[PDB]
Design an enzyme around this catalytic site. Structure first.
Site, short mmCIF file in Angstrom:
data_model
loop_
_atom_site.label_atom_id
_atom_site.label_comp_id
_atom_site.label_asym_id
_atom_site.label_seq_id
_atom_site.Cartn_x
_atom_site.Cartn_y
_atom_site.Cartn_z
N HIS A 92 47.43 41.92 27.06
CA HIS A 92 46.47 41.87 28.25
C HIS A 92 47.00 42.66 29.45
CE1 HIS A 92 45.58 38.02 26.11
NE2 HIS A 92 44.46 38.75 26.07
N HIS B 192 50.49 42.04 40.92
CA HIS B 192 50.58 40.62 41.16
C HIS B 192 52.00 40.13 40.93
CE1 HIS B 192 46.04 40.12 40.24
NE2 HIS B 192 46.30 40.56 41.48
N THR C 178 43.50 34.90 37.46
CA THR C 178 42.43 35.80 37.13
C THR C 178 42.27 36.06 35.66
OG1 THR C 178 43.66 37.86 37.38
CG2 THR C 178 42.61 36.94 39.39
ZN LIG Z 1 47.15 39.39 37.66
#
Ligand SMILES: [Zn+2]
Length: 257
Positions: free
Chosen positions: A61, A116, A195
């Site tokens: 991902h 992030h 998210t």
């Molecule tokens: Zn993220």
């Protein structure tokens, strides 16, 4: 299972994770004209001098750069936060083209990518416990624009060939995340969620106003990664971003005038 295609992307997640249509989902559009300055907010304290990176992993991902979070070595405090939050990993979201890729948007502007830095609240003892709490995580979000190279990113870029496909990892010691930060720590903050599935509503978001610049060549290397495992049909890891979600009954606060 979930992903970022037509058949398994963000618009499908709610079937397995009904919290996708919750009251505090992320990301959101930041409307800079309606975010109010809050003078009671503190400067952010980012204390990364003792950070200990361990490994980099393609999880199918994104890729995560993982840290030793067994002691207070890299911590975030201050700002909107009460208490101390330990750095566990960072990762990015990016696009197929420079005009998209960020999760948050600023006055509907999409950046090429978004970093992030994920931290958990030490009062809950471990990450897994923290994500069950509404104040369990603090995520520092940093926008990436394409321009000049970011020197401090290059060590990450150059290991990506070794973790091309899902499930691959590589040793990634001695990486200093300070080299990923912009000059200013001015920020917006709001309460939200992870998210990606499971989309848990456990995050205090701290989104920096000032983007970092990366080069086209740097971002191009991100886009050579694969979502697939080794010896499977190649599907480039691009467009691994969730679009903006309804703000609902939230206010976005600014640390600056
Ligand atoms: Zn993220």
């Amino acid at each position: 299972h979930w992903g970022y295609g037509k058949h398994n992307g963000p618009e499908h997640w709610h079937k397995d994770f009904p919290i996708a249509k919750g009251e505090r989902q992320s990301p959101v559009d930041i409307d800079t004209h309606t975010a109010k300055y809050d003078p009671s907010l503190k400067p952010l304290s980012v204390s990364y001098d003792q950070a200990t990176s361990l490994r980099i992993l393609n999880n199918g991902h994104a890729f995560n750069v993982e840290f030793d979070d067994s002691q207070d070595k890299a911590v975030l405090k201050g700002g909107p936060l009460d208490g101390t939050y330990r750095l566990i990993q960072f990762h990015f979201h990016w696009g197929s083209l420079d005009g998209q890729g960020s999760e948050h948007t600023v006055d509907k502007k999409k950046y090429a990518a978004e970093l992030h830095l994920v931290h958990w609240n030490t009062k809950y003892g471990d990450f897994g416990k923290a994500v069950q709490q509404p104040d369990g995580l603090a995520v520092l979000g940093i926008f990436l624009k394409v321009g000049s190279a970011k020197p401090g990113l290059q060590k990450v870029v150059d290991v990506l060939d070794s973790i091309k496909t899902k499930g691959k990892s590589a040793d990634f010691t001695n990486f200093d995340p300070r080299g990923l930060l912009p000059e200013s720590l001015d920020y917006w903050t709001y309460p939200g969620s992870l998210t990606t599935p499971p989309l848990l509503e456990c995050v205090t978001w701290i989104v920096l106003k000032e983007p970092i610049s990366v080069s086209s060549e740097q971002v191009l290397k991100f886009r050579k990664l694969n979502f697939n495992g080794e010896g499977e049909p190649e599907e480039l890891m691009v467009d691994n971003w969730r679009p903006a979600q309804p703000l609902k009954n939230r206010q976005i606060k600014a640390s600056f005038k």
